Design a binder for this molecule. Structure first.
Ligand SMILES: Cc1cc2nc3c(=O)[nH]c(=O)nc-3n(C[C@H](O)[C@H](O)[C@H](O)COP(=O)(O)OP(=O)(O)OC[C@H]3O[C@@H](n4cnc5c(N)ncnc54)[C@H](O)[C@@H]3O)c2cc1C
Ligand SMILES: NC(=O)c1ccc[n+]([C@@H]2O[C@H](COP(=O)([O-])OP(=O)(O)OC[C@H]3O[C@@H](n4cnc5c(N)ncnc54)[C@H](O)[C@@H]3O)[C@@H](O)[C@H]2O)c1
Ligand SMILES: OCc1ccc2c(c1)OCO2
Ligand SMILES: [Mg+2]
Lengths: 1214, 107, 54
């Protein structure tokens, strides 16, 4: 049995002094990075004046010769949308291979009217890209209805001539500007013209981000075939005069990441070596492009091995990009220069600024890391670039610097820095094809600056070029190429010296004012939890030790009653991934001690309620600090107890920290003396989020002033006991927080205990239904139902149309379905693929599935851990075999023999015929796939809704019409657009569903605490200016009937209702996180009196609901002559079980009537109903007898606004 | 249609053009239910006409028009209300219903 | 353009024929100018050979 964490994340090689200096700079504060760069980039006044003169001369030449799309737009008086629509049409017409067939379709069919009839895939799938081309502005999604209107308008106005011009323009742009050629042979033919003028080329076959082994093999053979063509054409010109190739490591392996470093070195490295050997034979350059910041240091391990590999000796063509926007850049250069010296290889070093800026900002914010790995002010990158050029220019004997930039100021500074002594091979400039030639035609050649420039030349088809053209175009307001074309930007502004500008700032290197550090995402409201960077070798080394130390701890969980730990039946807790690994011991609670704990909680209730809310909140904040400091140890326990990977354990601890800080802040915003606690609250939690949900429920109940009986899932008591220990250390008295480990019997004994005043349950729908039945017997001392929050299972779908990017979909599907072995309530269960793309996506999905590593989770390389128990495994496997027995296609990863010591289920894909093939939630790594025809999208949404669940839901589409349709029709609590459907963030995606998935209110949302007090406070931002019109019609009807007081109460309910609340919640860049209040649906009304009925109806209608009124009330004559608008919302029900599902209930009666009704409601099939009851006298006395908070449904929607490939808002941030 | 607005000229020609900015991403949900019902009946051409009407309808357009500072000038497209349908044939009725429902109307 | 250049004369006629004040006569002529230019622009945005007149 291997020791826990003994092989967690060993580095590829021992970290040298130079490598350690790189890692140390990874997220160094920006104020610390800039001063040495300013110093290194400083040049003499004489040079600075000469550089400014050269830059001005270049810029004057550029502006003096400065259109294709612009001239088309001008000639035909096109609006921007017409221009975009025209280019999309042209793109689609160019997918027709035969020119005569295309021209015939244009002349006969397209021009003469209905283009829609002749052209499964929206014409406008790539309209965000064309929008960038036409307008210079990036939109994340496409207003396809606006584009369709614009296309119809422009064709009907201008006819075939405009279509012809659009087609010819798109053909030129896609075949000659965005790429040098469609194929390497075409690109090579077209390169002769500029090679004869002194340019060189580096060809990019556009491979990137392989998703499957087959993808990686295709990109490999593309590179290999290109090397042959380039080498044949180079014909002995060598690496400086002759052409080369550029590759992306991410194209060559589907798991190119630090977590998979062993596979990278074993499988990716030999592929690079084979390509390098071919480049060596032809004596051409082979450049490794730089990608995301978390791949930089890993790529250095490949560069090191290749440069030390004697089989490659004699060839100086190996090249490597370094990104000056990165804080590690100068230290990377020190490492590379030293590697060049040690190996004797003159490494070609391409200095760039960097292509992933927006994405790096978003990623660091999402991951809660200390700082960014890139600068946040554009001028800092410019200074970094010039400083790094000074370092490179001092080492031209051992490296070949390649200065890639389109910025004339940057170019001029380096041209003068390098000096007058020049020979080919000393250094070169580089630029992008179809972008940099105007500038470099003022550089290359004896009549200019007589410096060479290598053109980075994309090569590929329309489909390949469009994939990441958005990133390449960002054209941002800060970009030189955008500014050169802005008439409002002066040449003096363009030749401004970034070195001297930075030097003169009041704080050198200050972070951008408009970019939040990850810790500050929420500003003054609360401190964001911090994560850990699993790509940082220092973090991995320290985590390895802390994780090993955590496995040497004698973790226990005991019944921690107010009076101290209690005795009970004791058993070991075993690692689900390896039963030989004993994690700890749990002493379970007797049912007698559970009842005693509730009595102790009841006795302690006044003392805890008397702790002021601010001080209760301070305990939560202290617990958050303790959990943050203890995170490494907590990770180790979660990893071993709950089958979680390190990434998922980090997220788990972060969520716990966030719950604590969120409920603390919500308390400070709301709770006062009039919001009395319920009393002892029983918190019952699931195994699968064994710290986060556990902590969230308890923290909320405690901070609302209730003592808590905490019953953690029987599978995961140890982390729960540690959470209770931390809360107690933070100041929660033992009498206010009692831990009661044990199985469902302990939960049931707590629920049934006489003094239990509320129940917070997260777990399966079936168990919640048992608790609902238990509580249907029960009333509070005030004769009212015991509040139950029951957050339950999901049958979560993602719909993908033909506009979605398959690689993006597959990544989000693999994560959503199989992260944590599908043991997230939010996990993707049903992927719905539009028929026209289903086969391609399914092929990619199966290929990605087979790249997952399943095993014991104390290794960073493990993607998917075990299922929690053998019973869970048996239940999941029974489902898989049932499906397999029905003839459904089943794809499963093969499991390693090492899984035999634990309980594992391989990630599984099951292709279904109908969504009705599924019965109940299957809580495991089982993704079901359904296909749908586009016209059946609305029926499909019905089918998803028809399961009765309503937890998470995903939609991948670029089309606004589809987003609007699907999000308006889906009925789920957490929606996700163009991203995964998991990892909801507290206070950002308040989490919780409807129907079989939850009663609400949402955890991590603003209505939660109000359920845990007897009188709900007004949550922050909780109001709506909108009044339900059916409520208004009802109020007028009431006045017409003479029910004047009820009409006034109805109007008051109309105003008090927060139906229609529509907020954007603060969060990371590149995402829009929305929170809205909608109607719940159909509310069951059980009235006793006419006035009670009118009050119930007003409450329900004011919150947008329809109603089913108990026909046994005999109150039919009280609703005579309703306006049609109100009648449409009213039904009468003699058989409540026949007229559901309902989404809540309002009950009027005395205590025994309430109890009887509550029992009947609990017996209704389907969802647990949030019931509110009041007596007739309470209705008369209290305008809030029925609280409107619980008659609306919260919906959270998270939209990935970077999905098009860039962040529009951050294009304005420089 | 309103004078000084974008629908006006289209009333004065025998085939109306698509006015500038005249579209909406919203689809009437009753139209959608009608299309599914047509689908189930095998009324394939009518279901297609219904879906097309749902998409081309500009119901829900909600624009701010350029104007002076210190003023917000909004232009929105709502349902007309209740439309009188005088069909002759079943298919004609289905097409009329599609047009009226797609634009948010009752009939 | 002609109405704009002749607005002072048009105002005089509108003031005396229709009982308008000078400010309201200005608004009247401006609105006529705006209709002319608006329908001109809307035409340039929309009308093609298939939009036959009544
Ligand atoms: C031939 C060639 C090869 C390239 N290869 C690669 C590669 O392998 N990997 C890669 O990542 N990039 C690469 N790039 C660069 C990237 O694609 C952009 O072209 C480059 O960063 C633009 O810089 P510029 O000096 O031409 O323009 P500029 O307008 O001078 O600089 C723009 C750059 O500034 C940076 N920036 C913008 N805003 C901010 C901000 N708020 N804070 C900090 N920095 C900011 C970004 O890096 C941005 O690209 C390459 C570029 C060329 C010309
Ligand atoms: N909606 C959400 O936010 C959310 C979050 C996480 C998990 N879940 C759901 O939780 C489930 C997985 O967790 P689980 O396997 O631990 O669920 P579960 O229903 O098996 O157990 C949950 C808890 O209820 C207790 N319990 C069992 N029987 C009981 C009874 N008769 N009376 C009182 N308590 C009883 C258990 O001991 C445990 O503490 C999944 O269905 C998942 O979808 C929902
Ligand atoms: O557009 C220039 C460019 C070249 C190579 C790249 C890149 C951008 O991003 C990462 O690799
Ligand atoms: Mg269970």
């Amino acid at each position: 049995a291997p020791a826990p964490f003994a092989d967690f994340a060993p580095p590829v090689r021992p970290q040298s002094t130079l490598r350690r200096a790189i890692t140390a700079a990874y997220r160094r504060p920006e104020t610390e990075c800039l001063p040495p760069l300013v110093e290194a980039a400083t040049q003499s006044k004489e040079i600075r004046d000469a550089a400014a003169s050269t830059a001005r001369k270049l810029i004057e030449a550029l502006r003096g010769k400065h259109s294709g799309v612009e001239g088309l737009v001008q000639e035909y008086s096109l609006s921007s949308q017409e221009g975009v629509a025209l280019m999309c049409l042209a793109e689609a017409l160019l997918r027709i291979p035969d020119t005569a067939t295309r021209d015939a379709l244009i002349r006969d069919k397209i021009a003469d009217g209905n283009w829609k009839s002749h052209l499964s895939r929206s014409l406008f799938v790539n309209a965000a890209t064309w929008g960038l081309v036409v307008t210079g502005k990036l939109t994340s999604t496409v207003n396809d209805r606006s584009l369709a209107a614009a296309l119809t308008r422009l064709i009907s106005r201008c006819g075939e001539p405009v279509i012809r011009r659009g087609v010819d323009m798109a053909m030129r742009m896609m075949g000659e500007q965005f790429v040098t050629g469609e194929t390497i042979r075409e690109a090579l033919k077209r390169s002769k013209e500029l090679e004869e003028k002194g340019f060189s080329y580096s060809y990019d076959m556009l491979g990137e981000a392989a998703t499957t082994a087959a993808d990686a093999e295709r990109y490999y053979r593309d590179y290999e075939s290109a090397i042959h063509a380039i080498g044949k054409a180079s014909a002995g010109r060598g690496i400086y005069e002759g052409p080369g190739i550029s590759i992306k490591l991410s194209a060559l392996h589907p798991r190119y990441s630090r977590a998979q470093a062993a596979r990278v070195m074993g499988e990716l490295l030999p592929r690079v070596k084979a390509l390098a050997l071919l480049a060596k034979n032809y004596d051409i350059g082979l450049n490794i492009d730089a990608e995301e910041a978390d791949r930089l240091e890993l790529s250095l391990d490949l560069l090191e091995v290749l440069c030390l590999d004697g089989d490659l000796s004699g060839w100086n063509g190996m090249g490597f990009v370094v990104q000056a926007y990165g804080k590690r850049c100068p230290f990377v250069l020190d490492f590379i220069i030293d590697l060049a010296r040690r190996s004797g290889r003159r490494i070609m070093v391409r200095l760039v600024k960097g292509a992933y800026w927006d994405a790096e900002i978003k990623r660091a914010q999402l991951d809660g890391l200390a700082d960014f790995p890139v600068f946040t002010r554009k001028i800092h990158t410019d200074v970094s670039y010039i400083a790094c050029a000074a370092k490179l220019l001092a080492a031209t004997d051992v490296v070949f610097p390649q200065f890639a930039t389109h910025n004339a100021q940057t170019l001029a500074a380096i041209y003068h820095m390098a000096g007058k002594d020049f020979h080919v091979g000393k250094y070169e400039f580089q630029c992008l094809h179809g972008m940099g030639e105007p500038l470099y035609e003022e550089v290359v050649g004896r009549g200019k600056l007589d410096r060479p420039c290598r053109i980075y030349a994309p090569v590929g088809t329309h489909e390949t070029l469009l994939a990441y053209l958005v990133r390449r175009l960002l054209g941002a307001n800060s970009s030189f190429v955008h500014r050169i074309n802005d008439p409002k930007v002066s040449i003096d502004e363009l030749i401004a010296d970034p070195v001297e500008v930075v030097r003169a700032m009041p704080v050198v290197g200050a972070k951008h004012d408009r970019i939040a550090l990850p810790a500050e995402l929420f500003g003054d409201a609360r401190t964001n939890s911090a994560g850990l960077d699993l790509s940082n070798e220092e973090t991995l080394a320290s985590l390895t030790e802390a994780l090993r130390e955590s496995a040497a701890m004698k973790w226990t969980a005991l019944p921690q009653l107010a009076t101290g730990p209690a005795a009970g039946e004791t058993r070991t807790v075993l690692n689900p991934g390896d039963h030989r690994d004993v994690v700890g011991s749990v002493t379970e609670t007797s049912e007698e001690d559970a009842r005693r704990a509730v009595r102790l909680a009841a006795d302690a209730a006044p003392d805890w309620a008397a702790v002021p809310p601010s001080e209760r909140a301070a305990c939560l904040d202290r617990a958050a600090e303790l959990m943050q400091a203890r995170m490494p140890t907590l990770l180790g326990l979660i990893i071993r107890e709950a089958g979680k990977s390190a990434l998922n354990a980090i997220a788990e601890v972060r969520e716990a920290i966030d719950f604590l800080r969120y409920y603390a802040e919500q308390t400070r915003r709301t709770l006062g003396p009039g919001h009395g606690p319920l009393g002892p609250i029983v918190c019952i939690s699931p195994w699968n989020f064994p710290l986060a949900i556990f902590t969230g429920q308890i923290a909320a109940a405690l901070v609302a002033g209730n003592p808590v009986l905490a019953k953690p899932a029987e599978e995961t008591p140890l982390i729960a006991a540690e959470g209770v220990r931390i809360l107690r250390e933070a100041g929660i008295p033992a009498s206010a927080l009692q831990l009661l480990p044990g199985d469902g019997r302990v939960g049931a004994a707590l629920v049934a205990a006489a003094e239990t005043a509320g129940v917070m349950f997260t777990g399966s729908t079936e168990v919640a239904r048992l608790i609902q039945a238990q509580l249907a017997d029960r009333l509070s001392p005030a004769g009212r139902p015991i509040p139950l929050i029951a957050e339950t299972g999901g049958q979560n779908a993602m719909i993908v149309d033909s506009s979605a990017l398959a690689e993006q979909v597959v990544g989000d599907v693999i994560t959503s379905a199989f992260d944590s072995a599908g043991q997230r309530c939010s996990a993707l269960r049903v992927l719905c693929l539009q028929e026209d793309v289903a086969d391609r996506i399914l092929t990619m999905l199966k290929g990605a599935l087979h790249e997952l590593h399943i095993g014991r989770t104390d290794r960073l390389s493990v993607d998917v851990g075990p299922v929690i128990t053998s019973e869970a495994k048996d239940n999941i496997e029974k489902h898989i075999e049932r499906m397999r027995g029905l003839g459904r296609k089943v794809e499963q990863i093969g499991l390693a023999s090492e899984t035999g010591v634990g309980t594992f289920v391989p990630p599984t894909i099951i292709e279904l015929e109908k969504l009705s093939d599924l019965q109940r939630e299957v809580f495991g790594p089982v993704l079901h796939v359904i296909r749908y025809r586009r016209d059946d999208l609305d029926r499909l949404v019905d089918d998803v809704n028809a399961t009765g669940y309503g937890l998470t839901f995903g939609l991948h589409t670029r089309l606004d019409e589809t987003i609007a349709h699907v999000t308006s029709r889906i009925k789920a609590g957490n929606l996700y657009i163009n991203r995964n459907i998991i990892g909801a963030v507290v206070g950002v995606q308040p989490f919780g569903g409807r129907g079989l998935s939850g009663t609400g209110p949402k955890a991590g949302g603003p209505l939660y605490l109000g359920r845990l007090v007897t009188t709900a406070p007004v949550p922050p931002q909780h109001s709506s200016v909108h009044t339900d019109p059916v409520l208004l019609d009802f109020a007028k009807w009431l006045d017409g009937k003479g029910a004047r007081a009820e009409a006034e109460a109805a109007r008051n309910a109309g105003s008090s209702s927060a139906l229609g609340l529509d907020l954007e919640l603060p969060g990371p860049v590149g995402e829009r996180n929305l929170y809205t209040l909608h109607a719940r649906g159909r509310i069951l009304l059980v009235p006793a009196t006419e006035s009670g009925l009118y009050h119930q109806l007003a409450a329900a209608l004011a919150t947008g609901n329809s109603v089913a009124i108990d026909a046994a009330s005999g109150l039919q004559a009280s609703l005579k002559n309703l306006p049609q608008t109100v009648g449409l919302r009213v039904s009468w029900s003699k058989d409540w079980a026949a007229d559901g599902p309902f989404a809540g209930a309002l009950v009027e009666g005395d205590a025994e009537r309430i109890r009887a009704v509550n029992k009947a409601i609990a017996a209704l099939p389907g969802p647990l109903l949030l019931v509110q009851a009041a007596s007739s006298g309470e209705i008369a006395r209290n305008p809030d007898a029925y609280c409107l908070n619980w008659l609306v449904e919260e919906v959270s929607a998270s939209i990935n606004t970077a999905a098009a490939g860039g962040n529009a808002s951050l294009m304005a941030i420089g």
